[PDB]
Design a protein around this nucleic acid. Structure first.
Ligand SMILES: [Zn+2]
Ligand SMILES: [Zn+2]
Lengths: 72, 83, 94, 147, 109, 61, 83, 97, 94, 109, 83, 98
DNA sequence: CAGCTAGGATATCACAATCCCGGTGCCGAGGCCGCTCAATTGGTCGTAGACAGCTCTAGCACCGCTTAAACGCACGTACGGATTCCGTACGTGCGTTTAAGCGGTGCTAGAGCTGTCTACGACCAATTGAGCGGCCTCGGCACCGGGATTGTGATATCCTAGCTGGCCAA
DNA sequence: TGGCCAGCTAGGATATCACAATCCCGGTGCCGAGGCCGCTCAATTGGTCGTAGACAGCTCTAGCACCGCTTAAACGCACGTACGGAATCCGTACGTGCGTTTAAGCGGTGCTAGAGCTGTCTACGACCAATTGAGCGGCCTCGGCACCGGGATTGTGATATCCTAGCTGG
């Protein structure tokens, strides 16, 4: 599979939601489109935190890794 | 002399649902319709096994209302209106 | 032709004393009979146990006062004892 | 204290005296009173005047008074001792009635004896069996003692 | 001449049968001998309890605009009064139903 | 003398029959003379040989 | 209401003891009598209403537990215009 | 057309069945169940109709009480749907198991 | 100098017939006495009510069988009835 | 000089006192008259129940490596057996303690 | 004559904790202690009321062990070990 | 270095400790004071047998342990491990004490 | 940077369900009736327990001393609860399928009442040996101090993944 | 300049070791289980005597069986929403440990209330024979209430009007 960063960007682009994709929607998309290991949920949670701190993702709902995200 | 075991299904899902409705239940999960009829037969076995031994001690062949009333009374479930 | 006894007459008289113009269904009368029998058995059994505990052989009003105090709760027991003592006093006054 | 109620009842009785009957204390003791009644009209006891005794228990008006006849009379519901078998004196007592009503009830029982619960079985038997005989004997005894 | 028959219940100003209560007591194997005032006390207690139930039952019936007491009214009278409810907590009344109550969580909001 | 009734003490000398004692009891208390009995009418106190401070007991009513 | 806001002595007196109303208790039959007369006649004779024979046993037991027996409004009104 | 949103019909059923006093279980299948259960303790037993009615009254009351307890347990568990966990908990607390 | 009774001797005899080399505390003996009295009262109370219900006036072993069947649960009741019947048979034999 | 006294318990080969049980029955106000076999049956039942409880308690004691039965051993014996536990479900035993058990959710994992 | 009060705090927080630990309770909230005080007070009030009634029926000023045993037995919680 | 156990680890060991011992867990002197204080409200200057006071304590402690078992079961049923006063109320209400 | 579009709440409108009201017949509440059995009255006999007097158990009070338990405060882990969020297990509302309910006649097990009589249990005195308290003593176990096994927690090491930097290729 | 590969660093998980708690062990000393005794009271023995109940004989009540229409209740299914549960995140309440404070328990003493047991004597209740009306079933009839059809009120669900923040396009 590609980097979790790219898988998260692809998930948010695939799911054309007005609010962006939730952590749960991103988790569902990645598990259905890519061969990910058992650690996927932890790697997605970590990658979302990093992408929000780097400014690649804008938080629309919730706080931290919980909630919904859009591409900046 | 030929009663089978299917009569437990006689207590239907709508009957149990309306019993719960009287009991004040809003909504019922599907697994309850088996648990409740499991409970009911346990209750009835306990009561009937005491009614029938009363009748045996009275050397009778029929089960009277007073036998059931006594059986319920000895379980701390006294019932009014039948004697 | 075995004549059986109940408390229907007395229940009806008390009903007429309390509500002069109210009837009672036949099935409700049986419920009242069962209630009367149940309370009678409770009180008499309690009095018998008191008499046996205190090595007596007589059930008097003294035992029934205690039995009522044990069985009935609170203000109901207070009023019941008040009613019972008054009736015993009137009975002995005559 | 029953003295206030006894005095108030006496004051009202003086304010509204009865027609055929009369009562009141016959001394300083408000608890012991004498009641004087006349034979009601159209009765065998008519013409005679009966004197009664009163003993107020110390709980009035919440207990019935001890009242009986001091005049010998012929009545089923009345014994030879002058006692009166009446519900308002035994069971129908209520603190909300006046002595005048009691006397009127006594006169009514004199006119209307109750043989269901008498005090002398023979008088009740006569009253049930021969009303004319009861009316004659009550009149004779009213003339003999109440007159 | 012996006397007129006055019932012990009438002596005590009761309605319940003092003589019948005495017979039941001394035939129920409760004690070797039975005191004189015991039936008088017991009959008065039973009469008071029955009257207490009947007053509430009649009030419930008249709140339902009916003139005959049915077991539904008895159940409504018993389960509303706290004292009687605690006295008869382990008693089932035939044709009695239950007291209408719904938990506030289940109501729509 | 003194007379006990089983309670108003005391009462008449050994000179008055049961009727007068009952009448005085009724006057002093209000209890009916004939109600209920005397346990120990036309009889007297000396007829029963009733001494002073004797304990008396006083149905139809 | 008793009546009234100014209960002249004839009404301010008890209906039984005829003295000034001391801690009057309003019956369900709307009869008003003082706390002494009430606390006497309750267990004194028949637990009934002396005026209109009304049974008060259920009302009495209802109010005794909560100590709601004494009519606070009229008892305060009497203190304002009477000792 | 028309469509009641879920829950309202259940509430009106609760109000209806808490106001009536009729027996909620069909008499004939209940009798068959009773006769089936009793047929092992003794064979060819006979029953009075009054006895069968007493059994049905007691059983219905017991079930109604059990449901009243099990509803409070489920509410305490922060739910509105009854499930057999609640029945088990109520039976265990009431000392029946 | 009141002579009070218990079942301690019989409890000890049964204990020695079951575990010949086991002691019992004084407090445990009191518990056994309380248990014995409780069960005796339960059985006697059930038998008395049975005799009253069936319009009898004699408590016999026939009533005690039914009382045991009502009180003891399941296998315990079956074993107790088996034990009681054998003892009655042996007693009636001699 | 009539015969050697044999107790009814010995006649039935029991241990509990048949005579004492018989006396308790008729002095207990249970019925007017008492059948002859009633004390025999009752004594047999009580002896059997005591034997059962003592067997279980002795097993519990020897599992605790002791020789004298204490209320703790009786509690352990009663609570483990399902029949006795249901029989004495409403009984509190002094110095009995509780059966040691911890819910699996509370265990650390 | 030796009037005392405020003894309910004698049931200390560590004592309640020890009871709950025997009950098989791992973690305890802070509001448990007061409600346990209330529950225990209610239970003791209900038992002592019957014990005292049993004593004063026999007309003696000393509450014995058998009175407590009877008071518990009549509440459906038979207790062994005291005769 | 200050050695500390993790929270709950000593709770489990003391659960095992107190579920094995049969001693009375409440202090006898304050319990007796409480019993006398309660009994003041029925008859004055009452006297107690020491065995009677012991019986009262033995019953009360067993009742409280039984109550705590059920109130722990309710808390577990609510999917948490800390018992809260609502759990005690639920247990008492289901048991029919209230 | 602004207007338009999407997401929200409040007020008003429509439909359905529980309601209620005056008429109608139908059966059980409730009343009288006369017989009979259980309550009453009047009388004898013996014994339960109310009371008074005496004993000595054990409940109470009180004090000083030892020390273990209770208290309260510091501190931080892991628990409860608040929030989002997703899937289907529920309720609702159709129509089709079924056996409960009723009124029907017919058939009799067995419930239930009487009247005979004898085997069984109450009641008793006189006979006596099991069970009791009193007394005594030593072996079981509570209590303590020394040495052991299991479980839990913390720390360290190793492995895997991620990110950054450098090099090569286009 | 971009992409790919390699290396280094950081984080997480797993394994091992240590520490503490319960545990397992004889030693040791206090005292209650348990046995011996001998006196006594409750159980046994044998005889009368009365009635409970078993056993039989008859009466008819209620339990029961098959039958065939007329619904209303059960059932099975379509559809979709609100509820349950899984997943994560934050703050603080509740556990643990420590130092200080408090009073339980112990055991030893001194005091009397009142528990509990004896004896005397009588008021009270059991019991029987006679008597009488309260309470019973049988009969009857009629008004309270179940059932129903035809309008009314309230509640729930849905739509339209007014309100804010965000995005794309100008
Ligand atoms: Zn007044
Ligand atoms: Zn009034």
């Amino acid at each position: 599979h590609p980097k979790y960063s790219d898988m998260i960007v692809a998930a948010i682009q695939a799911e054309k939601n007005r609010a962006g994709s939730s952590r749960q929607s991103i988790q569902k998309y990645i598990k259905s489109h890519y061969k990910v290991g058992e650690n996927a949920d932890s790697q997605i949670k970590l990658s979302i935190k990093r992408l929000v701190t780097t400014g690649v993702l804008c938080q629309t709902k919730g706080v931290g890794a919980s909630g919904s995200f859009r591409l900046a | 002399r030929k009663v089978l075991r299917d009569n437990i299904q006689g207590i239907t899902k709508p009957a149990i649902r309306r019993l719960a409705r009287r009991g004040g239940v809003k909504r019922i999960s599907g697994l309850i319709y088996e648990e409740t009829r499991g409970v009911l037969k346990v209750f009835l076995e306990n009561v009937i096994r005491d009614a029938v031994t009363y009748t045996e001690h009275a050397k009778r062949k029929t089960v009277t209302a007073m036998d059931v009333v006594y059986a319920l009374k000895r379980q701390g479930r006294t019932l009014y209106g039948f004697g | 032709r075995s004549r059986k006894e109940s408390y229907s007459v007395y229940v009806y008289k008390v009903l007429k004393q309390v509500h002069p113009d109210t009837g009672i269904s036949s099935k409700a009368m049986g419920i009242m009979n069962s209630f009367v029998n149940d309370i009678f058995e409770r009180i008499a059994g309690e009095a018998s146990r008191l008499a046996h505990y205190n090595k007596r052989s007589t059930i008097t009003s003294r035992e029934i006062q205690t039995a009522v105090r044990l069985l009935l709760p609170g203000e109901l027991a207070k009023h019941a004892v008040s009613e019972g003592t008054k009736a015993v006093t009137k009975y002995t006054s005559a | 204290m029953a003295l206030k109620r006894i005095n108030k009842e006496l004051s009202d009785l003086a304010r509204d005296p009865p027609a055929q009957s009369s009562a009141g204390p016959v001394g300083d003791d408000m608890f012991h009173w004498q009641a004087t009644i006349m034979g009601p009209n159209d009765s065998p006891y008519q013409g005679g005047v009966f004197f009664l005794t009163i003993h107020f228990p110390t709980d009035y008006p919440f207990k019935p008074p001890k009242v009986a006849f001091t005049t010998r009379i012929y009545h089923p519901n009345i014994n030879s001792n002058g006692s009166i078998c009446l519900d308002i004196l035994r069971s129908q007592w209520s603190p909300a009635l006046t002595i005048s009503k009691v006397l009127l009830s006594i006169s009514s029982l004199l006119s209307d004896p109750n043989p269901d619960d008498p005090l002398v079985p023979e008088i009740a038997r006569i009253y049930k069996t021969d009303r004319d005989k009861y009316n004659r004997i009550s009149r004779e005894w009213t003339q003999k003692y109440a007159m | 001449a012996r006397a007129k028959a006055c019932t012990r219940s009438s002596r005590a100003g009761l309605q319940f049968p003092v003589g019948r209560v005495h017979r039941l007591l001394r035939k129920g194997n409760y004690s070797e001998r039975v005191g004189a005032g015991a039936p008088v006390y017991l009959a008065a207690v039973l009469e008071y309890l029955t009257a207490e139930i009947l007053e509430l039952a009649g009030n419930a019936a008249r709140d339902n605009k009916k003139t005959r007491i049915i077991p539904r009214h008895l159940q409504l009278a018993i389960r509303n009064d706290e004292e009687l409810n605690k006295l008869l907590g382990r008693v089932t009344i035939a044709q009695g139903g239950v007291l209408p109550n719904i938990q506030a969580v289940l109501l729509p909001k | 003398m003194q007379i006990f009734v089983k309670t108003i003490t005391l009462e008449v000398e050994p000179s008055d029959t049961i009727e007068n004692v009952k009448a005085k009891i009724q006057d002093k208390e209000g209890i009916p003379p004939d109600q209920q009995r005397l346990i120990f009418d036309g009889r007297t106190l000396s007829d029963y040989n009733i001494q002073k401070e004797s304990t008396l007991h006083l149905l139809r009513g | 209401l008793p009546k009234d806001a100014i209960p002249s002595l004839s009404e301010c007196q008890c209906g039984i003891c005829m003295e000034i109303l001391v801690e009057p208790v309003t019956l369900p039959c709307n009869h008003t009598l003082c706390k002494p007369c009430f606390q006497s006649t309750v267990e004194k004779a028949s637990l009934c209403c002396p005026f209109c024979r009304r049974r008060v046993s259920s009302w009495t037991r209802y109010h005794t537990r909560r100590n709601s027996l004494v009519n606070v409004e009229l008892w305060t009104i009497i203190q304002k215009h009477y000792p | 057309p028309h469509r009641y949103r879920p829950g309202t019909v259940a509430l009106r059923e609760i109000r209806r069945y808490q106001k009536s006093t009729e027996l909620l279980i069909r008499k004939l299948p209940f009798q068959r169940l009773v006769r089936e259960i009793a047929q092992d303790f003794k064979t060819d037993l006979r029953f009075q109709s009054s006895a069968v009615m007493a059994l049905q009254e007691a059983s219905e009351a017991y079930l109604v009480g059990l449901f009243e307890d099990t509803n409070l347990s489920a509410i305490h568990a922060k739910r509105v749907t009854i499930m057999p966990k609640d029945i088990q908990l109520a039976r265990r607390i009431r000392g029946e198991r």
